[PDB]
Paper text:
Here, we present the cryo-EM structure of [name], a chain release PKS module without an ACP domain, and its structures with amidation or hydrolysis products. The domain organization reveals a unique “∞”-shaped dimeric architecture with five connected domains. The catalytic region tightly contacts the structural region, resulting in two stabilized chambers with nearly perfect symmetry while the N-terminal docking domain is flexible. The ~360 kDa megaenzyme uses only the KS domain to catalyze one C–N bond formation (or hydrolysis) and subsequently release the polyketide chain.
To confirm the binding mode predicted by the MD simulations, we tried to prepare cryo-EM samples of [name] with the amidation product 3 and the hydrolysis product 2, respectively, and the two complex structures were finally obtained. The cryo-EM map of [name] with the hydrolysis product was resolved at overall resolution of 3.97 Å and the hydrolysis product was captured only in the KS domain of chain A. The carboxyl oxygens may form hydrogen bonds with C197, T438, and L439. Additionally, the carboxyl group of the hydrolysis product could also form a salt bridge with H372 at a distance of 5.4 Å which also demonstrates the positioning function of H372 predicted by MD simulations. To consider the pyrrole and the carbonyl group of each chain as one unit, it is shifted ~6.5 Å and rotated ~53.6° from SNAC-N1 to the hydrolysis product, which the latter is able to further translate ~6.4 Å and rotate ~74.4° compared to the amidation product. The polyketide chain moieties are subtly moved within the range of 0.6 to 2.2 Å between the SNAC-N1, amidation, and hydrolysis products. The accumulation of 2, the hydrolysis product, was also observed. The hydrolysis of SNAC-N1 may be due to the open-ended tunnel of KS on each side, which is solvent-exposed. Similarly, a motion of this unit combining movement of ~5.8 Å with rotation of 34.9° is also observed compared between the amidation product and SNAC-N1. Together, the visualization of the products in the KS domain verifies the basic binding location in the substrate tunnel analyzed by MD simulations and further reveals the structural flexibility of the polyketide chain.
Author numbering:
A (entry chain B): 33 to 456
B (entry chain A): 52 to 253
C (entry chain B): 1670 to 1719
D (entry chain A): 457 to 658
E (entry chain B): 912 to 1467
F (entry chain A): 861 to 961
Amino acid sequence: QEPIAVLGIGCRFPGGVRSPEDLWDLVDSGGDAVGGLPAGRGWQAGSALDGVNAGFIHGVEEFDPYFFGLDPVEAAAMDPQQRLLLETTWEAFERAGIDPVAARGSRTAVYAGVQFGGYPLLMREAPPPQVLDHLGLGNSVGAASGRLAYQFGLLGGAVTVDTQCTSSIVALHLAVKALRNGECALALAGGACVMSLPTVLMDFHRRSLLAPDGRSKSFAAAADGVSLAEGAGMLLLERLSDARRNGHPVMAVIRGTAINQDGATNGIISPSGRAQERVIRAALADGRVTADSVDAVEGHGVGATLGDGVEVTSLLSTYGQERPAGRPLLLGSVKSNIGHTQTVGAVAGIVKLVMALRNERLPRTVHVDGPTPHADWSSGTVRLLTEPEPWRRGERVRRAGLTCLTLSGTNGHLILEEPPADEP
Amino acid sequence: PEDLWDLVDSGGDAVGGLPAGRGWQAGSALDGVNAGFIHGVEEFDPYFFGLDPVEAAAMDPQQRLLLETTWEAFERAGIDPVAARGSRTAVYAGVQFGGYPLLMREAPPPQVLDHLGLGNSVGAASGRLAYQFGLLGGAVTVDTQCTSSIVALHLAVKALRNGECALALAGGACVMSLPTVLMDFHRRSLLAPDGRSKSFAA
Amino acid sequence: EADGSGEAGLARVDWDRYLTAGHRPLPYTVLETRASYDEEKAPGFGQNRM
Amino acid sequence: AARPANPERTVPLVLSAKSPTALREQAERLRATITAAEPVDVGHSLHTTRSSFRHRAVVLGTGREELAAGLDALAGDRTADGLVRGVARAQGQTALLFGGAGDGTSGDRPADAEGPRTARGLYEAFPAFAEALDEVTEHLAGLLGPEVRAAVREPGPACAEPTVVGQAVAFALNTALHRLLTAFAVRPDATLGHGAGEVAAA
Amino acid sequence: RCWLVPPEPQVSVVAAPPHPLLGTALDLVDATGQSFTQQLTPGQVAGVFGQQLYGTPVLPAGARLEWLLAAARHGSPDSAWTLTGIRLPGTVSAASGTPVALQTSREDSGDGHRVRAFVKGPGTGGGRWAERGGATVVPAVTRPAPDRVDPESLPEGLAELDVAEVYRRLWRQGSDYAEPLRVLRRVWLGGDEAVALVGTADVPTGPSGWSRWAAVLEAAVQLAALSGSGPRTPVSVDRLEVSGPPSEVVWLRVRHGADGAADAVVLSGEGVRLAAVQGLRLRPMAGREPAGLAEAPLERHEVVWHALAEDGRPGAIGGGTGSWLVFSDDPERAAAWCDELALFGVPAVALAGEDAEGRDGTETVPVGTGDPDVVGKTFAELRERGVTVAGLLVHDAGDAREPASGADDPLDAACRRGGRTLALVRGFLQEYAEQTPRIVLCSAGAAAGLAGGPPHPAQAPLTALFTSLVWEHPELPCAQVDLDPAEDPPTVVSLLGQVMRLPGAGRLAVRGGRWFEARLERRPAPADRGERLALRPDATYLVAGGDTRHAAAALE
Amino acid sequence: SVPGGGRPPGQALLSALGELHTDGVAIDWSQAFEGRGARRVDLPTYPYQKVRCWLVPPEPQVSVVAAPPHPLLGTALDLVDATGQSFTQQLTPGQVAGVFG
Ligand SMILES: O=C(O)CCCCCCCCCC(=O)c1ccc[nH]1
């Protein structure tokens, strides 16, 4: 039950976002980032991607090899995912106000969410003989968490994890438990997702799973399909007591966390629904936070036609029973502005809620023509945030939750709170 | 465990010749290389676990060995797997991407193509165990090269101590579907020329 | 083949043609597998519809 | 263990498999282990550390020499006394038939003494039966006088003969065997009673 | 920039997909005419070779005809074409899992626009390239043709058939078609012509553009073969003329008016002429050799007895639907089983042969006279009493005729046993088959290969008569049970019980308390044992009882 | 019959229940062992009935030349109507600098 402080966040997200401040400008202006296929990647796609729209990091094919002390040959051999984590971790220490030279030798742990991106399969020819020697460590999933710790000279634990889309919420749960266990002094948690090969967009298009206009219309009645997008992000964490001893900034406090599987039984009982209703209870208990005290939730909201309805049902079964008068649970999802973001969906959500706390407003969910008919809104105890509302500091401590789901059956929840923010 | 004890107590070793039966396109690039193989990793029993044989052909051999080895673990733990369904058991597997779809010298049949995804994504290897046995705990895969097994144990020990779960399953798998890691270790001359790990000897 | 060989022979035959040639509306357990029985299967991994 | 001494009472040894050939291979494995451990400990293990699949077999024997002959009979697939085989169909669908004393006077009356004269041996053989029979027997004595207690201990021809003592012993033994079957977890969906013994079915 | 592969151009050509039989053109510098080459991988073969003859994959005749048209039209945008003097030797075939090389060429004839095309089939290993089709090409057809004909006017002279029986007729001609080539949707046939409705003929590359002609032309072969009898395959066509790609529906007409040759015309849904074919001959390859084309190996086939140790419990007899008839060589056995069926509440009647004594109050039947009429005139009397029959048991005494007659002749005994059993069984089938009775033949010591004593040869007509029923009255359920000839016979409720668990037909046997069932099963045959064999030199050998053709080969 | 069976009185009841267990009833055998000296032991695990499950059909064990094509001469064609042999190569951009020294 020690609270864990987010000291700083760094990220790259669709539509030219490079900082938490940029993501705020994008959501508060109600824009969306989904666009055309990238040029400049080696993609010789057939007719199979004609009309496919998605969210891409423009410029992932560019890097600055000299700043991190690499040979340009090695910088070419590395998976784009390893490079985004490395570039984002420097930005994470800088906004946290820590000198990377003072971080050397620290008991900082690393917990990275990464999935194998297939990068060397772009080659038509056999590789040049100088590149070949670097291709092993350049593309192994286990090397991604090791490289960060070598570059920044960190001496704590280092792990790469994979759990499909929940990989960032699972990485963050391990980092929170590590800091509470007393294993490490700081912890670095996050992930990356970059489409070096087109094959995942082709696999979703062949099965007709994508929305036709490429929008994840989160919780709306339109509900046409999902939308794949890229993204990368790192959070730096420390125990709240140690953060206040040193005098580092606190942007938000992580209070409680949980993970579960949705098991295996007949789909008629809604097994993924029962799984969410246990995982929320577990996360509230881990943080010792009462279910009336949460104001809002950054829902998974991917736009799958039944799945958003199972999520809305699970929230009514779990939060929607004990609401104070005039305090109905506000629901939204960042996937509406930037697409699904695959492995980093939890970081995108945390950046939104961290910026919402700092600016005393909750942003609207875009493209909501009317609420989804697959769940019962008749309690009035839960609603979509269809016009933005104020969220002032005051006598009630502000709190919010995040959810992530995936088809392999992992589910999770996090609770966030205000910084204590003592007067200057 | 008893087979390992018989080998070890009789003072033998188990490094030998390269596998037949796997479809390997290794020319002279593995000539004279010796290594330790699981014979018959290409053979499996789909009807026991409830898989149609085309899905059982789509799966990476690493997902198959973990699934087989888990049943044997429960049968010695004295727990009937039918009694374990609905338990708060967590799964932590040390696993790596095996490249198994790259064995195919041609585009696959359209029946197997739609199963290769969850057949070969590393993050499926935790979830599929939890599905087959109906386990409700957290289910993660970890990778840090050789140490991926200690990392899985450490996270499982810390999960049980913190009261997250009632049981935990921790371990890993490694199979050479493709020859390429042996080709490169031979190319850079890292292998002993007689193939033995002379562990601390002169 | 000293004993226990039964009725035994040597030829090129495809029995799936043979039992469908002429015509036959009911099973014949000398060539056909005897019967079905009560068992059930899961909807597969990843699939979670309805 | 502080393990008690005993006479060589029969052991029920249970095997199950998901297909027929696997049952026969399981008998060849287990036949090499019943030689080392005591049969009561092997039977207690297989009842509890294993699942209950669709293809089934049961072997009965007093000791190691008989049980080995049963497992060999399964392994070669040949019928022998004390071996039973079959394929389960999952539905419950069970009913239980009860009868009065006096119908044993209709014909072959000494066989309806010899059944009850055999049935007395169950009192030493099983824990659940003795307490049930004793509870009924001491409960009946207050309606009848002491001679019913001798009659339950000496179940001769009275069990076949239309008499108050005969009907009392018949109700006692039927009630006791019903508690025996429910201790073995057989649960009836229907009951039928023939003649004056209908009270037992009720 | 830090990336492995340099970036793609802002604009590029579509690089259109090749037709799978002709592949990508070669670029030899000095060559007199164009050539093209392909390898089919073992996975691709099943999509291109859409037809099976006797299990082996073969290339459809409409596909060879389209291959020549695709080879012809490669150099020009022109929408109408003509092929003449078309010849298609042999069968293109590919044994399961093998590679298939293909090659094709074009040569200018020097006669203005006239060009020659050829196709050559797989060279591999010690084998060499061989011709598999040739045609002459004349471009720019540039001639008028008839005005529209209403497709709905065409069928009136002919009966309609179910498309299921159309493909079953082709199955009885050795041929089966994969789903992409099952393009028929309605068919009419009779006399010297046929007409048909053809769906979207969507071969590989066929969902749009010219390639759809492969399966439209193959429908003309399917329909042309449907009119004949005995297996046959296309060999020549004298003209093919085509304009445009075929519409999503087309109508075919096929006629047999030329001496040994078909003509065919393809019409659009609007009644426009799409293509025509003249002088289509199958007759020069009527009845070509299946034994060289069949996929199956030489194997050893054996009737193996499996115990019913799994599920071996009798189950109930099927209720009071009608009586059971019991006939036996022994009046005491017939009576005993009629007493047993009475204890179980099943109605039964006892029958005996009229050369046996009427010892135990049975009916009597003239079995022993070889004639089904006098037997039938006896069974008809039971129907006139109002008796109804569920089934019939015939029980044989086994070796007991040997000590009873006091002399041995197993071949005369077999002649008698056949004659008796035939008289009973035929006589019964004539009188009751509309009731769907069940027939059970109960031999003893007839089953081969089982343990416990030798088989008795005089039983053999019973196993023959059982299989003689199974294929000739295929709607009637029946079974043979073979008893042990020396152990005591089982309770009749056990026999009938286990037999009522079989729908259809089967062979069962009893030895001890076990029930067994026969299955015909297969294993590889080591013919190389004979390749190592030589017979001993200091001996004589007999070849006996054969004709000239068998004897000459035995002597060889 | 539940009381009736073979001569030892326990074998009758255990066989009668054994047939019900065999047919499918979920019988709890623990009363046969209760009050007796029973322990627990490690026993052999389930015997799998394995079959080949692999994407690729097994390759034939034939020896062949390791790298036969010469960098300029390339592949020899088998054009059927040819008067004499012709050979072709395409060089990819990364090969060109290796052959052109
Ligand atoms: O820690 C050590 O000393 C052991 C090093 C072993 C590294 C093995 C990495 C294997 C990754 C294979 C892979 O990611 C792949 C193969 C084909 C396509 N991708």
